Amino acid sequence: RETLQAYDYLCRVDEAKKWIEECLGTDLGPTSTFEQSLRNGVVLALLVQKFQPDKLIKIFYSNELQFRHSDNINKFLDFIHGIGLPEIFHFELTDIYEGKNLPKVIYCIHALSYFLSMQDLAPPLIKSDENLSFTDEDVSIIVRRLRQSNVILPNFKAL
Numbered sequence: 501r502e503t504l505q506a507y508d509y510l511c512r513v514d515e516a517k518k519w520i521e522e523c524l525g526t527d528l529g530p531t532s533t534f535e536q537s538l539r540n541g542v543v544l545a546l547l548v549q550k551f552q553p554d555k556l557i558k559i560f561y562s563n564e565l566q567f568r569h570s571d572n573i574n575k576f577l578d579f580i581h582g583i584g585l586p587e588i589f590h591f592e593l594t595d596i597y598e599g600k601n602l603p604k605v606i607y608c609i610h611a612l613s614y615f616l617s618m619q620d621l622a623p624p625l626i627k628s629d630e631n632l633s634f635t636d637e638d639v640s641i642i643v644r645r646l647r648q649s650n651v652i653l654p655n656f657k658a659l
């Protein structure tokens with residue numbers, strides 16, 4: 501049951517990654533380290549820029565994850581709120597910056613994809629191939645993370 505839960509969530513992360521890769525037309529590295537790469541808010545802010553082409557979005561760049569990275573995050577939060585994405589799909593700064601609930605970010609990304617794709621404002625998220633696989637090590641890492649984690653995975657299935 502643990503392995504499967506680990507594998508499924510990795511598929512959810514993979515699907516959100518691919519969707520963003522499609523929107524931005526770029527490669528975003530391994531799925532196993534994708535959640536952590538969003539903590540600086542750059543990718544998410546770049547998403548705002550795409551959907552707000554007439555606005556000049558300010559993005560803080562730095563290898564070191566610091567408080568000013570919050571501004572990058574807030575751009576994305578102001579955006580999903582501005583376009584009317586239901587609040588139940590939103591996440592808080594602490595969930596991503598301090599990384600207390602990264603799965604909620606992935607969840608937010610899926611909901612946004614549907615909100616936009618249903619309106620033909622962006623491409624639709626693509627369900628993971630049935631034979632998509634990850635290394636046993638990557639799966640175990642997620643198993644370990646969920647054991648020490650006291651957060652409940654979001655309801656992707658009800659989307």
Ligand SMILES: [Br-]
Nearest residue numbers: 503504505507
């Ligand atoms: Br499995």
Ligand SMILES: [Br-]
Nearest residue numbers: 508509656657
């Ligand atoms: Br799932």
Ligand SMILES: [Br-]
Nearest residue numbers: 523524549550
């Ligand atoms: Br773009």
Ligand SMILES: [Br-]
Nearest residue numbers: 550552553554
């Ligand atoms: Br455009």
Ligand SMILES: [Br-]
Nearest residue numbers: 556557558575
């Ligand atoms: Br801005």
Ligand SMILES: [Br-]
Nearest residue numbers: 585586587588
């Ligand atoms: Br609402």
Ligand SMILES: [Br-]
Nearest residue numbers: 586611614615
């Ligand atoms: Br919606």
Ligand SMILES: [Br-]
Nearest residue numbers: 523621622623
């Ligand atoms: Br598009």
Ligand SMILES: [Br-]
Nearest residue numbers: 644645646648
């Ligand atoms: Br851990």
Ligand SMILES: [Br-]
Nearest residue numbers: 602645649651
């Ligand atoms: Br977690």
Ligand SMILES: [Br-]
Nearest residue numbers: 512656657658
């Ligand atoms: Br699902």
